[PDB]
Amino acid sequence: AAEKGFKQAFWQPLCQVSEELDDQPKGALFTLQAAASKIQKMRDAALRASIYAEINHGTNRAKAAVIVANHYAMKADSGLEALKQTLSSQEVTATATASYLKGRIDEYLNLLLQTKESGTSGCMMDTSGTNTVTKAGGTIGGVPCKLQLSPIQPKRPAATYLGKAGYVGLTRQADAANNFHDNDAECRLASGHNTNGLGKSGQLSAAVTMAAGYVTVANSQTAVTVQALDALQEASGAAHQPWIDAWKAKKALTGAETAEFRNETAGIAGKTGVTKLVEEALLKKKDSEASEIQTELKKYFSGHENEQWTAIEKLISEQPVAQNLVGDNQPTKLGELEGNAKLTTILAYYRMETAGKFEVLT
Amino acid sequence: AAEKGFKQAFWQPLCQVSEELDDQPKGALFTLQAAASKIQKMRDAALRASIYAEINHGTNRAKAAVIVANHYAMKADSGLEALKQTLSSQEVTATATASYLKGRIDEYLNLLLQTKESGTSGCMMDTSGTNTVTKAGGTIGGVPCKLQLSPIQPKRPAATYLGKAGYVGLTRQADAANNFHDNDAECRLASGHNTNGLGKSGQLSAAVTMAAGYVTVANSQTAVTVQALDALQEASGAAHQPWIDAWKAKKALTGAETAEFRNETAGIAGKTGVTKLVEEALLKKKDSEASEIQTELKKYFSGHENEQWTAIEKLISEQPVAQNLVGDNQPTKLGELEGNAKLTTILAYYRMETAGKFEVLT
Ligand SMILES: *[C@@H]1O[C@H](CO)[C@@H](O[C@@H]2O[C@H](CO)[C@@H](O[C@@H]3O[C@H](CO)[C@@H](O)[C@H](O)[C@@H]3O)[C@H](O)[C@H]2NC(C)=O)[C@H](O)[C@H]1NC(C)=O
Ligand SMILES: *[C@@H]1O[C@H](CO)[C@@H](O[C@@H]2O[C@H](CO)[C@@H](O[C@@H]3O[C@H](CO)[C@@H](O)[C@H](O)[C@@H]3O)[C@H](O)[C@H]2NC(C)=O)[C@H](O)[C@H]1NC(C)=O
């Protein structure tokens, strides 16, 4: 009936979205950290290749290790520039839009949860619309609904409730009078009329919209209107803009999964850096033919397809640094040493060794 | 009087906090980007030093430039690890806590803004408590209150309404009956009693708290109670935990201003990397007394205080590159070249030259 407490078929959907939005910061955390860890891994690969080039100068595989090292430096570099330029705003924008909307929902839902008179007359009713609900654990009567933001630790959010299309549970309502509103449980929050709703001496001046422009409450003796948020299109100035915004933001996310954070397993001449380095340094001739790139590569790699890039990488990994550099009975092989700070210093030990030579050498 | 619409004294404070908490994402953005830009600048300095050590390999000036280059690599490296480990969660946590609380406030304030009957009876009143206020632009009658989250673009923001100790304007209220509540404007949201408040056939079951546990609304014919939020202590399970949380998070922020993102202008032996590199590579005597560190440094730097570190740095920034390595009419000096990707390339050209000179020589 109109101007009556809300039955679970109204509020369970909003609970689901609130609890799903709760994971958006956790996701943002996960991604921002994933981007640095990946930048770090590319850096580590370039450090390992550089150190091999320093130890093994004179050989051709040393020149190969420089091309490997420059590619991974460039990866590690474009990763940090992607983090700055794209990923930071994206995850901040997702975290903020989702949290602001979660706040809006939660305030409304906790109003309803609190405006009750008896255990059978109130604003928040069970499915049956026989009793009011009570929070127990992080559920409002069994339904998982904490109505507060959980502590942010990294993890991937689900997209069940907010998908690529909009809010799936916030479909159109055909019969709000019956499916949302109880037959008799009283709620003044259910209308804007002075009799069984929010008006005191009169109906209010106009319709009130609640939950960030989700539900409209009229000053007339009528039932609620809810927006269908399941098939959204981007808009501005929309009454339920918060909903649009959290959707649009979540929808724009790529994660630390773009090109820059992914390794390339194609042919050597195609890898980030190779052809342009071969033209500039080795060939000293710009805009050359793919064959003459292929040729130079065969000198260092023994070919030009991914299996020779790995073979060099294997040499780089098997390559051991001095025990004087890494501890006691500790792992000395480069493939077994990780950590930018650690590897940056092993590199400076060998950059120092290379200076020593060239002062006796020239 | 009790069970009456709220006068500007009550709501202007919440407007101020909502609007301040609007800048928290903008700040988070600003910092996350500031951290990458600073990591980038340290990297650029290590790239410039490395290239000088390459272009001049085998000298003591190249040996000095290696120590400079390893310090800046280590900075750039610990910056990305600080970004990952500390700054990411910090700014995500600040953005989410603030946005969730801004959502909670805004929903309450927009309820009040909407529950009005006449232009003189309602829930949101002016200071005089004579008229109901209205939202024009991003202001509800003069006082700035957009009641929505602004688009996130970078900004450094000075906290005035939320600061180190809590929410400044959310003071203990001595006389809510008079300073908050009007004499006669009607608001059902002002109590939980069935006569002029939210109860329908009866008072509600208990007190309702609103704005994330800020204001308590009793089922009795009484005036509102508001929490003093201006001298907070961290707590758990608190009725107004959102407030505590946004405070604690904002209070924990350091910004991209920690050690790792700041340059060190102390003596050379004290700089990040120098003594440990001198012991490991040059001295090959791990655990050497600072005088013998001072000595080695004099060989490269011509001393051991900050003015010699800069002099090397001057040489480094002076050092020109090959004309072909730069754009049509672009500068060739290292001090005049910025951009990790750009400099990573110049470094690989010279790493290749060193490769070729070492074999041309050996
Ligand atoms: C992009 O691809 C490169 C090449 O695979 C990655 O570098 C490699 O990273 C792994 C660790 O992730 C290192 O593996 C080592 O293998 C040895 C032998 O199997 C094992 O004993 C060690 O425990 C370790 O697993 C490998 O040495 C290293 N290779 C090079 C050339 O540095 C890089 O991490 C990838 N980047 C990203 C963002 O994933
Ligand atoms: C930490 O300190 C180092 C050393 O000051 C910074 O590197 C230096 O960065 C500046 C640009 O920020 C470069 O300055 C150049 O100066 C010349 C001559 O005055 C001028 O013509 C150029 O337009 C440019 O301003 C300088 O070359 C560079 N020095 C080195 C050795 O790389 C570094 O940026 C600081 N780090 C952070 C995070 O601020």
Side-chain angles (χ1 to χ4, degrees), chain A residues 149, chain B residues 17 20-21 24 90 93-102 105 159-168 170 228-236 238 240-254:
Chain A
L149 182 79
Chain B
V17 176
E20 191 154 288
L21 290 171
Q24 196 73 332
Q90 238 175 57
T93 294
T95 302
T97 49
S99 292
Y100 181 69
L101 185 65
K102 177 173 181 159
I105 298 177
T160 86
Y161 301 119
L162 206 190
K164 171 185 184 287
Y167 307 75
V168 189
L170 304 195
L229 299 160
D230 66 2
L232 301 171
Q233 259 111 81
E234 58 184 51
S236 54
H240 42 272
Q241 198 75 69
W243 296 90
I244 298 173
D245 295 356
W247 163 75
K248 172 172 147 170
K250 182 163 163 151
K251 200 195 155 77
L253 308 178
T254 45

Short mmCIF file of all heavy atoms in Angstrom, two decimals, chain A residues 149, chain B residues 17 20-21 24 90 93-102 105 159-168 170 228-236 238 240-254:
data_model
loop_
_atom_site.label_atom_id
_atom_site.label_comp_id
_atom_site.label_asym_id
_atom_site.label_seq_id
_atom_site.Cartn_x
_atom_site.Cartn_y
_atom_site.Cartn_z
N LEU A 149 31.88 1.42 5.72
CA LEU A 149 33.07 1.18 4.93
C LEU A 149 34.10 0.26 5.61
O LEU A 149 34.64 0.54 6.69
CB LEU A 149 33.70 2.51 4.63
CG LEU A 149 34.94 2.52 3.78
CD1 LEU A 149 34.55 2.37 2.30
CD2 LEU A 149 35.68 3.82 3.98
N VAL B 17 32.33 21.09 6.39
CA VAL B 17 33.05 19.82 6.42
C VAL B 17 32.77 19.09 5.11
O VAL B 17 33.73 18.68 4.49
CB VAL B 17 32.61 18.90 7.61
CG1 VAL B 17 33.31 17.56 7.53
CG2 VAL B 17 32.99 19.52 8.93
N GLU B 20 34.94 20.55 2.50
CA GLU B 20 36.36 20.37 2.68
C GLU B 20 36.74 18.94 2.25
O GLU B 20 37.75 18.74 1.55
CB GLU B 20 36.74 20.60 4.13
CG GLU B 20 38.27 20.67 4.24
CD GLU B 20 38.80 21.49 5.41
OE1 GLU B 20 38.71 22.77 5.41
OE2 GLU B 20 39.36 20.88 6.39
N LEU B 21 35.92 18.00 2.68
CA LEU B 21 36.10 16.57 2.37
C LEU B 21 35.94 16.33 0.85
O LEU B 21 36.13 15.23 0.34
CB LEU B 21 35.05 15.74 3.11
CG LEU B 21 35.26 15.68 4.63
CD1 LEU B 21 34.08 15.04 5.36
CD2 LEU B 21 36.49 14.87 5.04
N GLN B 24 39.58 16.07 -0.61
CA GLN B 24 40.46 14.98 -0.18
C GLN B 24 40.90 14.11 -1.33
O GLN B 24 42.06 13.68 -1.33
CB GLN B 24 39.79 14.13 0.86
CG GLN B 24 40.77 13.25 1.59
CD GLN B 24 41.70 13.94 2.59
OE1 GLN B 24 42.08 15.12 2.54
NE2 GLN B 24 42.06 13.18 3.61
N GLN B 90 47.71 5.08 1.99
CA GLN B 90 47.44 6.33 2.63
C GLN B 90 46.47 7.18 1.83
O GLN B 90 45.41 7.55 2.35
CB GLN B 90 48.75 7.04 2.80
CG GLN B 90 49.08 7.37 4.24
CD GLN B 90 50.45 7.99 4.36
OE1 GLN B 90 50.79 9.02 3.75
NE2 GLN B 90 51.25 7.34 5.18
N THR B 93 43.01 5.29 1.36
CA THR B 93 42.34 5.36 2.61
C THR B 93 41.82 6.78 2.86
O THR B 93 40.67 6.94 3.27
CB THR B 93 43.35 4.87 3.64
OG1 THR B 93 43.55 3.48 3.32
CG2 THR B 93 42.94 5.20 5.07
N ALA B 94 42.60 7.83 2.61
CA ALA B 94 42.11 9.18 2.84
C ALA B 94 40.94 9.44 1.90
O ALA B 94 39.86 9.70 2.40
CB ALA B 94 43.19 10.21 2.60
N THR B 95 41.11 9.28 0.59
CA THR B 95 40.04 9.45 -0.37
C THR B 95 38.76 8.70 -0.04
O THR B 95 37.67 9.29 -0.09
CB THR B 95 40.62 9.04 -1.74
OG1 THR B 95 41.72 9.95 -1.83
CG2 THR B 95 39.74 9.17 -3.01
N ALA B 96 38.83 7.45 0.32
CA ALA B 96 37.64 6.68 0.67
C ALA B 96 36.98 7.13 1.97
O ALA B 96 35.75 7.34 2.01
CB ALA B 96 37.99 5.22 0.83
N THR B 97 37.73 7.32 3.05
CA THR B 97 37.11 7.70 4.29
C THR B 97 36.40 9.04 4.19
O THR B 97 35.24 9.18 4.58
CB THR B 97 38.18 7.72 5.39
OG1 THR B 97 39.28 8.46 4.87
CG2 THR B 97 38.51 6.31 5.90
N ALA B 98 37.09 10.01 3.63
CA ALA B 98 36.54 11.32 3.42
C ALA B 98 35.34 11.29 2.53
O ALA B 98 34.33 11.87 2.91
CB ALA B 98 37.57 12.21 2.80
N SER B 99 35.41 10.60 1.38
CA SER B 99 34.27 10.52 0.45
C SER B 99 33.01 9.82 1.01
O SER B 99 31.86 10.28 0.82
CB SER B 99 34.72 9.84 -0.83
OG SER B 99 35.62 10.70 -1.48
N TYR B 100 33.23 8.76 1.79
CA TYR B 100 32.15 8.03 2.40
C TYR B 100 31.45 8.92 3.41
O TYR B 100 30.21 9.03 3.36
CB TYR B 100 32.76 6.81 3.01
CG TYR B 100 31.70 5.99 3.63
CD1 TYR B 100 30.75 5.34 2.88
CD2 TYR B 100 31.66 5.98 5.00
CE1 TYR B 100 29.72 4.66 3.53
CE2 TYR B 100 30.65 5.31 5.65
CZ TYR B 100 29.68 4.66 4.92
OH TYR B 100 28.70 4.01 5.62
N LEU B 101 32.22 9.61 4.26
CA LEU B 101 31.66 10.57 5.21
C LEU B 101 31.00 11.76 4.52
O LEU B 101 29.94 12.21 4.98
CB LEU B 101 32.73 11.09 6.13
CG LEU B 101 32.34 12.01 7.27
CD1 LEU B 101 31.47 11.27 8.24
CD2 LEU B 101 33.57 12.52 7.95
N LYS B 102 31.59 12.28 3.43
CA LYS B 102 30.97 13.36 2.69
C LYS B 102 29.62 12.86 2.19
O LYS B 102 28.65 13.62 2.31
CB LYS B 102 31.84 13.80 1.50
CG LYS B 102 31.12 14.89 0.73
CD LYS B 102 31.75 15.67 -0.44
CE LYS B 102 30.66 16.68 -0.88
NZ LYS B 102 31.05 17.87 -1.63
N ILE B 105 27.08 12.89 5.30
CA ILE B 105 26.66 14.27 5.53
C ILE B 105 25.68 14.73 4.44
O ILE B 105 24.57 15.16 4.73
CB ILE B 105 27.91 15.22 5.55
CG1 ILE B 105 28.86 14.85 6.69
CG2 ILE B 105 27.44 16.66 5.69
CD1 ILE B 105 30.15 15.69 6.74
N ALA B 159 43.77 22.21 5.28
CA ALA B 159 42.72 21.79 6.16
C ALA B 159 42.48 22.89 7.17
O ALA B 159 43.43 23.50 7.68
CB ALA B 159 43.16 20.57 6.85
N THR B 160 41.20 23.25 7.31
CA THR B 160 40.79 24.28 8.23
C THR B 160 39.63 23.73 9.06
O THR B 160 39.57 23.89 10.27
CB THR B 160 40.41 25.62 7.41
OG1 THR B 160 39.07 25.55 7.00
CG2 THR B 160 41.20 25.84 6.09
N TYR B 161 38.67 23.06 8.43
CA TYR B 161 37.48 22.54 9.09
C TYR B 161 37.66 21.10 9.65
O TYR B 161 36.94 20.66 10.57
CB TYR B 161 36.28 22.60 8.10
CG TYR B 161 35.91 23.95 7.57
CD1 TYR B 161 35.98 24.16 6.22
CD2 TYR B 161 35.60 24.99 8.42
CE1 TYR B 161 35.73 25.41 5.67
CE2 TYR B 161 35.34 26.26 7.88
CZ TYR B 161 35.42 26.48 6.50
OH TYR B 161 35.17 27.72 5.92
N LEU B 162 38.60 20.33 9.09
CA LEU B 162 39.00 19.06 9.63
C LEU B 162 40.52 19.23 9.76
O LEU B 162 41.19 19.63 8.80
CB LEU B 162 38.72 17.90 8.69
CG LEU B 162 38.51 16.50 9.32
CD1 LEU B 162 38.50 15.46 8.24
CD2 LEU B 162 39.63 16.10 10.24
N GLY B 163 41.07 19.02 10.95
CA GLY B 163 42.50 19.17 11.15
C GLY B 163 43.06 18.18 12.17
O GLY B 163 42.39 17.21 12.54
N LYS B 164 44.22 18.48 12.76
CA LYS B 164 44.94 17.47 13.55
C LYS B 164 44.20 16.89 14.73
O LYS B 164 44.42 15.77 15.19
CB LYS B 164 46.25 18.10 14.00
CG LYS B 164 47.11 17.35 15.01
CD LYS B 164 48.31 18.19 15.44
CE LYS B 164 49.18 17.34 16.38
NZ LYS B 164 48.60 17.15 17.70
N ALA B 165 43.27 17.69 15.25
CA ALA B 165 42.63 17.33 16.50
C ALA B 165 41.17 16.86 16.36
O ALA B 165 40.64 16.28 17.31
CB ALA B 165 42.73 18.54 17.39
N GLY B 166 40.57 17.08 15.19
CA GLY B 166 39.20 16.72 14.92
C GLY B 166 38.53 17.82 14.11
O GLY B 166 39.17 18.71 13.52
N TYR B 167 37.21 17.71 14.07
CA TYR B 167 36.34 18.64 13.37
C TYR B 167 35.99 19.90 14.23
O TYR B 167 35.06 19.95 15.04
CB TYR B 167 35.10 17.81 12.96
CG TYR B 167 35.35 16.52 12.19
CD1 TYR B 167 35.83 15.36 12.81
CD2 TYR B 167 35.12 16.52 10.81
CE1 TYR B 167 36.10 14.23 12.04
CE2 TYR B 167 35.37 15.39 10.03
CZ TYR B 167 35.86 14.26 10.67
OH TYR B 167 36.22 13.22 9.87
N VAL B 168 36.79 20.95 14.03
CA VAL B 168 36.80 22.28 14.66
C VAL B 168 35.46 22.97 14.93
O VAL B 168 35.27 23.65 15.95
CB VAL B 168 37.66 23.29 13.79
CG1 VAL B 168 37.87 24.62 14.58
CG2 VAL B 168 39.01 22.66 13.40
N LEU B 170 32.59 21.38 15.10
CA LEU B 170 31.61 20.51 15.69
C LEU B 170 32.05 20.32 17.16
O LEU B 170 32.75 19.45 17.71
CB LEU B 170 31.56 19.27 14.74
CG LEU B 170 31.26 19.46 13.17
CD1 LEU B 170 30.90 18.16 12.58
CD2 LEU B 170 30.01 20.24 12.86
N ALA B 228 30.47 16.31 20.14
CA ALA B 228 31.57 17.24 19.95
C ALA B 228 32.68 16.45 19.21
O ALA B 228 33.23 15.45 19.69
CB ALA B 228 32.05 17.76 21.31
N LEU B 229 32.93 16.86 17.98
CA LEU B 229 33.89 16.19 17.10
C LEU B 229 35.21 16.93 16.95
O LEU B 229 36.09 16.41 16.27
CB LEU B 229 33.17 15.90 15.69
CG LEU B 229 31.90 14.99 15.77
CD1 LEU B 229 31.06 15.16 14.58
CD2 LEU B 229 32.29 13.54 15.98
N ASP B 230 35.37 18.11 17.57
CA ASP B 230 36.60 18.89 17.53
C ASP B 230 37.81 18.49 18.39
O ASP B 230 38.84 19.15 18.31
CB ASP B 230 36.29 20.35 17.82
CG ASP B 230 35.77 20.75 19.20
OD1 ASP B 230 35.65 19.90 20.10
OD2 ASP B 230 35.50 21.94 19.37
N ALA B 231 37.77 17.47 19.26
CA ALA B 231 38.99 16.99 19.90
C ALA B 231 38.97 15.45 20.04
O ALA B 231 38.87 14.85 21.12
CB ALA B 231 39.15 17.62 21.26
N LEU B 232 39.09 14.78 18.89
CA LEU B 232 38.98 13.35 18.76
C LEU B 232 40.18 12.57 19.28
O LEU B 232 41.30 13.06 19.39
CB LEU B 232 38.74 13.02 17.30
CG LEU B 232 37.55 13.60 16.57
CD1 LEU B 232 37.65 13.33 15.09
CD2 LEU B 232 36.30 12.92 17.07
N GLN B 233 39.91 11.33 19.66
CA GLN B 233 40.88 10.34 20.06
C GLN B 233 40.53 9.13 19.20
O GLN B 233 39.33 8.94 18.91
CB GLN B 233 40.75 9.94 21.52
CG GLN B 233 41.77 10.63 22.40
CD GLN B 233 41.15 11.65 23.33
OE1 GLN B 233 40.61 11.29 24.38
NE2 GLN B 233 41.17 12.94 23.00
N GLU B 234 41.51 8.34 18.75
CA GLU B 234 41.13 7.23 17.91
C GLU B 234 40.42 6.14 18.70
O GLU B 234 40.75 5.86 19.85
CB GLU B 234 42.34 6.66 17.18
CG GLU B 234 43.62 6.12 17.78
CD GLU B 234 44.62 5.75 16.67
OE1 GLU B 234 44.89 6.57 15.78
OE2 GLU B 234 45.14 4.64 16.69
N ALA B 235 39.38 5.58 18.09
CA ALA B 235 38.53 4.61 18.76
C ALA B 235 37.98 3.61 17.75
O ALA B 235 38.09 3.79 16.52
CB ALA B 235 37.35 5.32 19.41
N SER B 236 37.40 2.54 18.28
CA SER B 236 36.76 1.57 17.43
C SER B 236 35.34 1.45 17.92
O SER B 236 35.03 1.91 19.03
CB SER B 236 37.51 0.21 17.51
OG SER B 236 37.70 -0.33 18.82
N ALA B 238 32.87 3.17 17.71
CA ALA B 238 32.24 4.41 18.06
C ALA B 238 31.06 4.72 17.15
O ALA B 238 31.19 4.70 15.93
CB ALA B 238 33.28 5.51 17.98
N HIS B 240 30.10 7.25 15.78
CA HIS B 240 30.38 8.27 14.79
C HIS B 240 31.74 7.96 14.19
O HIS B 240 32.53 8.83 13.80
CB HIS B 240 30.35 9.68 15.46
CG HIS B 240 31.04 9.68 16.81
ND1 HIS B 240 30.39 9.41 17.93
CD2 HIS B 240 32.37 9.88 17.11
CE1 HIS B 240 31.29 9.41 18.90
NE2 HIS B 240 32.48 9.70 18.40
N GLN B 241 32.02 6.67 14.15
CA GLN B 241 33.25 6.17 13.63
C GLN B 241 33.59 6.77 12.31
O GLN B 241 34.75 7.13 12.20
CB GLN B 241 33.15 4.70 13.52
CG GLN B 241 34.50 4.10 13.41
CD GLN B 241 35.20 4.10 14.72
OE1 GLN B 241 34.84 3.39 15.63
NE2 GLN B 241 36.23 4.88 14.86
N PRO B 242 32.74 6.95 11.29
CA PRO B 242 33.07 7.60 10.03
C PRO B 242 33.91 8.86 10.23
O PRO B 242 34.98 9.01 9.62
CB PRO B 242 31.74 7.89 9.39
CG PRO B 242 30.97 6.66 9.74
CD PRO B 242 31.39 6.39 11.17
N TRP B 243 33.49 9.68 11.20
CA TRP B 243 34.16 10.93 11.55
C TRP B 243 35.58 10.68 12.06
O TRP B 243 36.57 11.31 11.62
CB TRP B 243 33.30 11.65 12.62
CG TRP B 243 31.90 12.06 12.11
CD1 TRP B 243 30.81 11.22 12.22
CD2 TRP B 243 31.57 13.29 11.56
NE1 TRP B 243 29.81 11.92 11.73
CE2 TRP B 243 30.20 13.15 11.34
CE3 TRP B 243 32.25 14.44 11.23
CZ2 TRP B 243 29.50 14.19 10.79
CZ3 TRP B 243 31.52 15.46 10.69
CH2 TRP B 243 30.18 15.34 10.48
N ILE B 244 35.70 9.68 12.95
CA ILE B 244 37.00 9.31 13.50
C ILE B 244 37.93 8.88 12.38
O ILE B 244 39.04 9.39 12.28
CB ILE B 244 36.82 8.17 14.51
CG1 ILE B 244 35.94 8.74 15.63
CG2 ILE B 244 38.18 7.65 15.03
CD1 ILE B 244 35.53 7.66 16.66
N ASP B 245 37.44 8.00 11.53
CA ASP B 245 38.16 7.43 10.42
C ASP B 245 38.68 8.38 9.37
O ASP B 245 39.81 8.18 8.92
CB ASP B 245 37.27 6.42 9.76
CG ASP B 245 36.91 5.22 10.61
OD1 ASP B 245 37.41 5.09 11.73
OD2 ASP B 245 36.14 4.39 10.13
N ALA B 246 37.84 9.33 8.92
CA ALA B 246 38.26 10.32 7.96
C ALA B 246 39.32 11.19 8.58
O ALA B 246 40.30 11.44 7.88
CB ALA B 246 37.11 11.19 7.58
N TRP B 247 39.18 11.56 9.86
CA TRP B 247 40.20 12.28 10.64
C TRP B 247 41.52 11.52 10.68
O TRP B 247 42.53 12.00 10.15
CB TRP B 247 39.68 12.56 12.12
CG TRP B 247 40.65 12.95 13.27
CD1 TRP B 247 41.23 14.20 13.40
CD2 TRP B 247 41.05 12.11 14.27
NE1 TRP B 247 41.99 14.15 14.48
CE2 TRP B 247 41.90 12.93 15.00
CE3 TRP B 247 40.80 10.81 14.64
CZ2 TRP B 247 42.54 12.50 16.11
CZ3 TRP B 247 41.45 10.36 15.77
CH2 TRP B 247 42.30 11.20 16.48
N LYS B 248 41.52 10.33 11.26
CA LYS B 248 42.70 9.50 11.39
C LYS B 248 43.45 9.32 10.08
O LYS B 248 44.68 9.44 10.06
CB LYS B 248 42.25 8.19 12.00
CG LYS B 248 43.38 7.18 12.01
CD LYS B 248 43.12 5.87 12.75
CE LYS B 248 43.89 4.74 12.00
NZ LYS B 248 43.94 3.46 12.71
N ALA B 249 42.71 9.06 8.98
CA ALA B 249 43.29 8.91 7.66
C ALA B 249 43.93 10.19 7.19
O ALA B 249 45.11 10.19 6.81
CB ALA B 249 42.22 8.51 6.70
N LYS B 250 43.20 11.31 7.21
CA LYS B 250 43.77 12.58 6.80
C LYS B 250 45.00 12.97 7.63
O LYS B 250 45.97 13.59 7.17
CB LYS B 250 42.69 13.60 6.93
CG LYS B 250 43.09 14.97 6.51
CD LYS B 250 41.82 15.77 6.31
CE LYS B 250 42.19 17.24 6.30
NZ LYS B 250 41.30 18.10 5.51
N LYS B 251 44.97 12.57 8.90
CA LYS B 251 45.98 12.93 9.86
C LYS B 251 47.23 12.13 9.58
O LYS B 251 48.35 12.60 9.80
CB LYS B 251 45.41 12.66 11.28
CG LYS B 251 46.04 13.35 12.45
CD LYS B 251 45.56 12.65 13.69
CE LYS B 251 46.58 12.83 14.84
NZ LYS B 251 46.54 14.14 15.48
N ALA B 252 47.10 10.89 9.09
CA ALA B 252 48.26 10.07 8.75
C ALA B 252 49.00 10.46 7.48
O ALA B 252 50.04 9.88 7.19
CB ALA B 252 47.86 8.65 8.60
N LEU B 253 48.56 11.46 6.72
CA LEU B 253 49.19 11.66 5.44
C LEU B 253 50.53 12.36 5.53
O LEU B 253 50.66 13.29 6.32
CB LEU B 253 48.27 12.45 4.51
CG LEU B 253 46.85 11.90 4.36
CD1 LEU B 253 46.10 12.86 3.45
CD2 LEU B 253 46.83 10.46 3.83
N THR B 254 51.53 11.90 4.76
CA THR B 254 52.82 12.59 4.71
C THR B 254 52.99 13.35 3.45
O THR B 254 53.69 14.36 3.45
CB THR B 254 54.00 11.64 4.82
OG1 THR B 254 53.75 10.52 3.95
CG2 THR B 254 54.23 11.22 6.28
#
